[PDB]
Write an enzyme that holds these catalytic residues in place. Structure first.
Site, PDB file in Angstrom:
ATOM      1  N   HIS A  80       0.892  -1.081   0.021  1.00  0.00           N
ATOM      2  CA  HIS A  80      -0.066  -0.178  -0.015  1.00  0.00           C
ATOM      3  C   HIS A  80       0.967   1.154   0.091  1.00  0.00           C
ATOM      4  O   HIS A  80       0.583   2.295  -0.187  1.00  0.00           O
ATOM      5  CB  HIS A  80      -0.752  -0.015   1.164  1.00  0.00           C
ATOM      6  CG  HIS A  80      -0.193   0.789   2.335  1.00  0.00           C
ATOM      7  ND1 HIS A  80       0.563   0.068   3.366  1.00  0.00           N
ATOM      8  CD2 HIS A  80      -0.351   2.069   2.712  1.00  0.00           C
ATOM      9  CE1 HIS A  80       1.031   0.835   4.339  1.00  0.00           C
ATOM     10  NE2 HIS A  80       0.514   2.092   3.837  1.00  0.00           N
ATOM     11  N   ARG A  81       2.188   0.937   0.137  1.00  0.00           N
ATOM     12  CA  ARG A  81       3.121   2.046   0.239  1.00  0.00           C
ATOM     13  C   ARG A  81       4.345   1.144  -0.410  1.00  0.00           C
ATOM     14  O   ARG A  81       4.817   0.439   0.185  1.00  0.00           O
ATOM     15  CB  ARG A  81       3.536   2.537   1.693  1.00  0.00           C
ATOM     16  CG  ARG A  81       3.784   3.921   1.865  1.00  0.00           C
ATOM     17  CD  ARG A  81       2.271   4.429   1.663  1.00  0.00           C
ATOM     18  NE  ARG A  81       2.319   5.868   2.254  1.00  0.00           N
ATOM     19  CZ  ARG A  81       1.357   6.879   1.783  1.00  0.00           C
ATOM     20  NH1 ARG A  81       0.671   6.579   0.764  1.00  0.00           N
ATOM     21  NH2 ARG A  81       1.063   7.687   2.621  1.00  0.00           N
ATOM     22  N   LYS A 121       9.791  -8.780   5.147  1.00  0.00           N
ATOM     23  CA  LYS A 121      10.662  -9.296   6.101  1.00  0.00           C
ATOM     24  C   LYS A 121      11.276 -10.626   5.568  1.00  0.00           C
ATOM     25  O   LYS A 121      10.507 -11.338   4.742  1.00  0.00           O
ATOM     26  CB  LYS A 121      10.011  -9.540   7.491  1.00  0.00           C
ATOM     27  CG  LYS A 121      11.048  -9.908   8.540  1.00  0.00           C
ATOM     28  CD  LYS A 121      12.094  -9.114   8.636  1.00  0.00           C
ATOM     29  CE  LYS A 121      12.804  -9.451  10.054  1.00  0.00           C
ATOM     30  NZ  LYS A 121      13.254 -11.000   9.898  1.00  0.00           N
ATOM     31  N   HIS A 190      21.799   1.592  -5.795  1.00  0.00           N
ATOM     32  CA  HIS A 190      22.431   1.175  -4.566  1.00  0.00           C
ATOM     33  C   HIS A 190      21.339   1.491  -3.321  1.00  0.00           C
ATOM     34  O   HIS A 190      21.715   1.472  -2.295  1.00  0.00           O
ATOM     35  CB  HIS A 190      23.614   2.172  -4.372  1.00  0.00           C
ATOM     36  CG  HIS A 190      24.839   1.406  -4.922  1.00  0.00           C
ATOM     37  ND1 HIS A 190      24.910   1.603  -6.458  1.00  0.00           N
ATOM     38  CD2 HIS A 190      25.679   0.586  -4.453  1.00  0.00           C
ATOM     39  CE1 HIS A 190      26.058   0.755  -6.698  1.00  0.00           C
ATOM     40  NE2 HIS A 190      26.547   0.405  -5.456  1.00  0.00           N
ATOM     41  N   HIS A 204      25.315   8.279   7.876  1.00  0.00           N
ATOM     42  CA  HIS A 204      25.858   8.672   9.033  1.00  0.00           C
ATOM     43  C   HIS A 204      24.669   8.883   9.941  1.00  0.00           C
ATOM     44  O   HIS A 204      23.793   9.484   9.513  1.00  0.00           O
ATOM     45  CB  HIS A 204      26.904   9.695   9.226  1.00  0.00           C
ATOM     46  CG  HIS A 204      28.204   9.639   8.214  1.00  0.00           C
ATOM     47  ND1 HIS A 204      28.125  10.285   6.836  1.00  0.00           N
ATOM     48  CD2 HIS A 204      29.245   9.137   8.383  1.00  0.00           C
ATOM     49  CE1 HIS A 204      29.412  10.164   6.433  1.00  0.00           C
ATOM     50  NE2 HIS A 204      29.976   9.335   7.309  1.00  0.00           N
ATOM     51  N   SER A 208      23.814   4.477  16.045  1.00  0.00           N
ATOM     52  CA  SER A 208      23.027   5.286  17.273  1.00  0.00           C
ATOM     53  C   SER A 208      21.553   5.017  16.980  1.00  0.00           C
ATOM     54  O   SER A 208      20.955   5.282  17.773  1.00  0.00           O
ATOM     55  CB  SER A 208      23.763   6.299  17.608  1.00  0.00           C
ATOM     56  OG  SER A 208      23.067   7.470  16.883  1.00  0.00           O
ATOM     57  N   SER A 388      24.927  13.462   0.573  1.00  0.00           N
ATOM     58  CA  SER A 388      25.147  13.400   1.752  1.00  0.00           C
ATOM     59  C   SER A 388      24.282  14.710   2.364  1.00  0.00           C
ATOM     60  O   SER A 388      24.324  15.776   1.740  1.00  0.00           O
ATOM     61  CB  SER A 388      26.335  13.199   2.315  1.00  0.00           C
ATOM     62  OG  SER A 388      27.252  14.216   1.716  1.00  0.00           O
TER      63      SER A 388
END
Lengths: 496, 496, 496
Positions: A80-81, A121, A190, A204, A208, A388
């Site tokens: 749906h997306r 998945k 890519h 980047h 984290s 970037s």
């Protein structure tokens, strides 16, 4: 204990229903033509079942010249997306149902944080330990070719990613194989996968990513009065104390930012023993220890706390490890008023009820650890952009900032026979660091923060919308179900 | 004198080796499996040789109804980074080796300034002078079709550009032919080539691009203490004095910005005579002269300086002209402490040693004139974006700036019975101009500045990394080799 | 001795000129507008130069984990006819010029036998002996990917083939790599190359292809009165006697069919010694010998003939081996009246003159060994058709044949009180074998025969057209040049 399949299936159904009535009524029953709006709820039944699931069997020639034929699966819950987004797991227990389930979660997780992707998945029934890196590269690339040929891997179709079992190596291999074979002509070849190393188009602020997500998720709720009232939180003496079960990327990084913002890490956990210290464990140190040698076991300035840290007394407990740790068993003995699910699925449906009953606020896995998906959406974007973040503006900005300050100075000096006396031109050291350290992660983390917050507010608004309490979890899935239904709603099926 | 082929081949080898040891050791020998890391240096041997080189022969019907069959070449050194970027030269001396060589340089030049492209370069063995524009259009378009059909010209494959021999006309013809034939279905068809006119998708800030690159390159080093110490530079009386050999786009523009920032242009050079004036030659004037009539020859306020300006006494000497001007011959007689190579390859490998020996700092062509490639990367980007930089933000920004100032005013007036007395709201004239002239070139030049600087710092850091001295050149190629190796390293070959 | 480059260049020029005058005049000068028909001969100048030539450098990881970077080339002489057809040679001496030359020949060779392909040819500067099969597969596949990406290998673009250096293994590898990567979506992906094994889409009748070509080539001329008159051939006692230099596929098979049709194989040759026997060497036996053990050396029923078999006295001498064997040196001492070039380029331009002068008829390599190209054209076709020749008709035909015979029988028995007495229904044993052994090779060889003949007649007709004598070779190239010119002529260049 149940299985994600049923758990998520349940999570889905529960909200699907809550949504049904409201969704139909005041929302669209406005023009109740034939009042067959209850029939147009067929959307939900289309929504629930993982749309397509591909199952492979492909060979690789094991280093010892022999032939092994590996088996894997990849399910795409919703298109749906467009680019279905989702990880690839290498483990001997991956199952069509596992994949089928997780792929579902992913669509809901993405909707929550408004990330424009369907859930998908994969699983390659393999044990990496049993293979040489050369064999792993072979498996990943062959896996990719197949995925590619049956429509389960392109940049505008499906964009895989790592899972604890896989990582940037596998991600690089994939991107590479696609971009040299099937995606040779694609200028965004890519972008076929996220999670790649920086040197191969990575972004980047990735590592984290998941931790900051946990941090910002907890934050948005912990600064929320109403919520903290029901818990008696935002305490005068209790304040901020967290216990992190599991010390991996997410647990590590959560401990870092929670701490960096005035939280006391009283006890950290692992697979072996645990640790304790009411005075506070420092993130950096514990980090360097776990790096300098194996586990956090025997951390100097750490009394080997024995018992389940889950039982530990703290305000916020973050299970940044193993599936379903909080169960009906220990649920009633937990001491924390906030359960921030850093891990995917650490509390069972039963335990939820118990917590609910005893006003323990559990911040849902669906929302809390969606920070990684958030940054992947940014990588993919980085891949499409072919640049970037901040590459063309950092300097432009530095200049304008300086102009603002110099304007304050000049304007202020016009209120004196001044010419170099009032010096605003000088930015705070903090702003000076920021300026001298402008880089992608900055923009990335900003976006993460902006999404986590705007979404927290959304989840909150729906809790109330649906009068759910500290039942953030079902408020979440509902928030998602509403979203997914809306896209279909403004289309249909074939008469879409 | 040697040939670029050997020179660059050498430049490459030299760094390849310096890199080898370090690169293997502390960098990756960490996990020295079989210690066959010295074998994985096979990357470097893959890196060195220009990957593919296409040689054509194609006809055009010369205006006098006859048939001529033109020959050309295009080499793509590396596709380790997708669109190979590189110019197209129309000259009777272009050779597979020339092209092969320059294409190599381009990959290293791009890596230095972190531009995501492989190096490529073309040559059409033709003398534009001998052809009518109509014949030139025919050659360029037919050339393009061929280039297109064999994979040497698409937007996500190879993106050509001008060379002193070619220009925006040829660039427009190319973009056009590709976008109407082979690239008809491509939404980024116009990104197939950079260097086009603005009306055809060009970017503003292109012409001066190369000059500002020279300016910023010299700047970054000239403000560097350590560097200026070794030279005894950043002088109290010596200060800033430059002699520019060659007065074309680059030499012109270099003279402009160097000057605009407090440098004294003592003597300018050409192909005919030279000029001199210790008191300073003004960029604008000399510019208008060279425009109003032929050469700078007989510039009023200019004593015909006779001798090689290379010998001239000045701090910085910029050869913005002819290949290898600084040779072992005159090298030892040069007076400048800084040789900023505005031109591509103006100093021979021997002269380098001499300068090195006598502490003359030579800022490498590889880095110093990469400003043009930098802006081309921006054009290509502009082409993909389908919008000019700042088109959607200039106004948003103007607004916020004004809010910042009005907030300073309001906050300050709350420290008085003020209501219109403290006026910060007024931006400095300088900021006022900036505000009223917001346009692409602004964003473009910012990006240029940001890249030139971030790269200068990188080149510096590697000099030290590899303990090179004022041997900026080999520090540069090393910087590049490291980068190129990294992309392969996080992939491989086929087991990539 | 000269090099193919010059030899073929010459062969070309020679005919180009002969063609010029005629071609312009009576042929097209009919409407001599501006009489600038001599200018429209620009076609020939476009025709001569090999259009595109690609040069690669690509790596493979040699079995001993190291990296080698192989270099190769592929030239496409003409695309005046779509799939450029041409072989791939693995030898350390392959050169752009070699490839450039051979690719030219191929276009002319194809035109001669009316095969709709442009000439192309490749070379991978490698020595197969130095590599493990695994490394050979790696080189061939990587080579293919590159070839594929720059437009030098698709089914409708360029269709490679073996060369003495390469074979059906390499051909299978190629077809495979193309069909699994770049040609994944192509329904005729397997037509990307010819020379493959039967199980991978090969055609039956391939191996002997080249031999039968030699056989039929010699035949067509040897049954030609006029030709045999000038030689005093079609002798009463001399009859048919051939000496085959070189005993490989072609030499082997030539010896077979020449013999099967009443020719006496007096002496066979090799790289070591030679053999002799005026009474006749039997093809099968000599075959089995060369198979049962190394060379034909010491063939029982074979006196080790010593001297160059080239000197041997026989009617037809077939150099089915090494380049330029017949030179000005031994040319004048040859005894054969017919030199059937089974090998590619076995006689030098000088030797040709000598033979010409002394009426030795040399059947050109261009035509004589084009039988292999002929069958490759059939493989490619088989690949497009997606069926083997005769798969759907053999039975239909068997039926109709039987009906014809049964009709003769029935009609004849109506001229008697017959009912099973006159039995035509019975096909000759020969026809019975044919019927019971119907298979592809049959259809293939028929097509070969039909092309070799129709072309022989064409070459003859041009000899006369251009009043050439027993100068079959230049009659051939002329025949080709005319053809190639015609395709362009009914088009142009860009105004094509």
């Amino acid at each position: 204990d149940p299985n994600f399949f049923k758990m998520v299936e349940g999570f889905f159904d529960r909200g699907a229903s809550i949504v049904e009535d409201k969704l139909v009524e005041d929302l669209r029953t406005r023009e109740s033509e034939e009042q067959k709006r209850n029939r147009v709820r067929g959307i939900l039944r289309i929504i629930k079942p993982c749309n397509h699931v591909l199952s492979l069997s492909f060979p690789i020639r094991r280093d010892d010249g022999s032939w092994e034929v590996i088996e894997g699966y990849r399910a795409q819950h919703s298109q749906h997306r467009t680019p279905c987004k989702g990880g690839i797991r290498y483990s001997t227990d991956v199952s069509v149902d596992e994949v089928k389930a997780l792929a579902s979660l992913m669509t809901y997780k993405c909707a929550v944080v408004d990330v424009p992707f369907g859930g998908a998945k994969a699983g390659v029934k393999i044990n990496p330990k049993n293979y040489t890196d050369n064999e792993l590269e072979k498996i990943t690339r062959r896996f990719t070719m197949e995925l590619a040929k049956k429509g389960f891997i392109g940049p505008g179709i499906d964009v895989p990613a790592p899972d604890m079992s896989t990582g940037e190596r596998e991600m690089s291999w994939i991107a590479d194989t696609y971009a040299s074979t099937i995606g040779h002509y694609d200028i965004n070849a890519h972008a076929c996968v996220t999670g790649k190393p920086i040197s191969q188009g990575g972004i980047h602020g990735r590592i984290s990513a998941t931790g900051r997500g946990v941090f910002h998720g907890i934050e948005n709720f912990i600064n929320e009065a109403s919520y903290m009232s029901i818990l008696g939180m935002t305490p005068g003496f209790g304040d901020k104390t967290f216990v992190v079960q599991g010390f991996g990327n997410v647990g590590l990084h959560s401990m870092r930012y929670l701490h960096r913002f005035g939280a006391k890490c009283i006890a950290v956990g692992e697979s072996d023993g645990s640790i304790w210290n009411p005075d506070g464990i420092d993130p950096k140190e514990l980090e360097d220890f776990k790096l300098q040698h194996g586990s956090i076991l025997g951390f100097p300035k750490a009394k080997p706390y024995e018992g389940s840290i889950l039982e530990a007394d703290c305000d916020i407990l973050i299970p940044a490890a193993s599936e379903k740790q909080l169960t009906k068993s220990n649920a009633p003995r937990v001491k924390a008023k906030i359960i921030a699910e850093g891990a995917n699925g650490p509390t069972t449906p039963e335990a939820d009820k118990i917590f609910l009953e005893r006003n323990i606020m559990v911040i849902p896995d669906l929302y809390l650890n969606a920070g990684g998906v958030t940054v992947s959406y940014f990588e993919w974007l980085k891949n499409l952009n072919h640049v970037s973040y901040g590459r063309l503006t950092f300097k432009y900005e530095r200049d304008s900032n300086y102009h603002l300050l110099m304007s304050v100075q000049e304007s202020l000096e016009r209120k004196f026979g001044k010419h170099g006396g009032t010096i605003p031109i000088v930015p705070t050291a903090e702003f000076q660091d920021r300026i001298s350290g402008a880089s992608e992660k900055d923009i990335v983390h900003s976006g993460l923060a902006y999404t986590m917050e705007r979404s927290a507010r959304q989840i909150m608004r729906t809790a109330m919308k649906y009068n759910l309490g500290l039942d953030l979890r079902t408020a979440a899935y509902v928030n998602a179900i509403e979203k997914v239904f809306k896209v279909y709603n403004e289309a249909g099926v074939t008469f879409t």
